[PDB]
Design a protein around this ligand. Structure first.
Ligand SMILES: NC(=O)C1=CN([C@@H]2O[C@H](COP(=O)(O)OP(=O)(O)OC[C@H]3O[C@@H](n4cnc5c(N)ncnc54)[C@H](OP(=O)(O)O)[C@@H]3O)[C@@H](O)[C@H]2O)C=CC1
Ligand SMILES: NC(=O)C1=CN([C@@H]2O[C@H](COP(=O)(O)OP(=O)(O)OC[C@H]3O[C@@H](n4cnc5c(N)ncnc54)[C@H](OP(=O)(O)O)[C@@H]3O)[C@@H](O)[C@H]2O)C=CC1
Ligand SMILES: CS(=O)(=O)Nc1cccc(-c2nc(N)nc(N)c2C#CC2CC2)c1
Ligand SMILES: [Co+2]
Lengths: 159, 159
């Protein structure tokens, strides 16, 4: 069971200048609830942006898609290809927009956090992947973050 | 990943007289996308209560939990304990109310449909399992079933 997890503005932006243009504690805890105990797969840039206190993320099998034979994520399995990383019953892909895209065909779940934020798309922006017709799921009921923005949740089996 | 899926009245009734006191085609179809292609484990009564036509549930690994050493179920595996069914990576328990109880300790997902139907509990009723503080839930927005009843989805997870 490959799945995808990400948080985006309504515009589809998920990353900007290597960081995130917001910070939702609530969504952090959801991210951890769904991934805890499972294998997590990330591209290099994602890994590098992890604050050292949680490189690797605890209780999870950290896997990094790179292609440098010497990249060596301290506390992570470095892997040259995606399907070379999915040996598991539950695997969550955690970005970035690049890794996401390569993973979407093998995926049956996407857990999507939508942040009510006017964030028009700028060149260079990292975007959430585009889910076609086969992806079904509720449109979560809105919520206030203690940060002051609105957010909601989305989920998609398929097949 | 072992999940529970059931529909319940607001009182907690999930069944009565061996059957269900509503019929929501939207919930039937949600049951279909969730379980499709995966392993489904049910008690012998739940299996019997399937009409000959859709027994076994197609596209799914039909497992029936029983004690009769002789019990046949053309199109299902009869196993003696729950775990004899936990091979595959995504597994969905569909009752009856006894088997839910067995499976709860192994479960991280409960996909629950609450039906806005005033169904005061009665003796003999099958009830929904009680979720303690450990289970997280994004509730749902009330929808309208064409059969006339409102209903909503709870998706429960714990690490
Ligand atoms: N909003 C959210 O929910 C999330 C936000 N983000 C944001 O998104 C961005 C992260 O995305 P991105 O910048 O793309 O970083 P990534 O970590 O996704 O970088 C991907 C890298 O992995 C390797 N790779 C990718 N695809 C393949 C493949 N098919 N085969 C082999 N190697 C591959 C490449 O390195 P190599 O050349 O070595 O192969 C590539 O450069 C950041 O800006 C971050 O802040 C991050 C995650 C979630
Ligand atoms: N609303 C909903 O979403 C749902 C509705 N339902 C309703 O619920 C009812 C079904 O639940 P219920 O009546 O409790 O029946 P069950 O489906 O729980 O029947 C359980 C059966 O499985 C076997 N079994 C039970 N426990 C064990 C065990 N520990 N080890 C081995 N075998 C075991 C037994 O068969 P044996 O006697 O041969 O040993 C037992 O009779 C029906 O009325 C149905 O309509 C069902 C599921 C979901
Ligand atoms: C670490 S961070 O990016 O600075 N900020 C942060 C904190 C906590 C969670 C999330 C997050 N939430 C959702 N919904 N989906 C996700 N994929 C991620 C993520 C991520 C990448 C770091 C690995 C983001
Ligand atoms: Co989990």
């Amino acid at each position: 069971m490959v799945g995808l997890i990400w948080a985006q503005a309504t515009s589809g932006v998920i990353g900007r200048g290597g960081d995130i243009p917001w910070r939702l504690p609530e969504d952090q805890a959801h991210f951890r609830e769904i991934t805890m105990g499972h294998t997590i797969v990330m591209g290099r840039r994602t890994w590098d942006s992890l604050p050292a206190k949680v490189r690797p993320l605890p209780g999870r099998r950290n896997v990094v898609l790179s292609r440098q034979a010497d990249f060596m994520a301290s506390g992570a399995e470095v892997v040259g290809s995606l399907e070379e990383a999915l040996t598991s019953p539950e695997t969550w892909v955690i970005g970035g927009g690049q890794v996401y895209a390569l993973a979407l065909p093998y995926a049956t779940r996407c857990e999507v956090t939508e942040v009510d934020i006017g964030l028009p798309r700028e060149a260079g922006d990292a975007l959430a992947p585009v889910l076609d017709e086969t992806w079904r799921g509720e449109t979560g009921e809105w919520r206030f973050s203690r940060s002051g923005l609105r957010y909601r949740l989305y989920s998609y089996h398929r097949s």
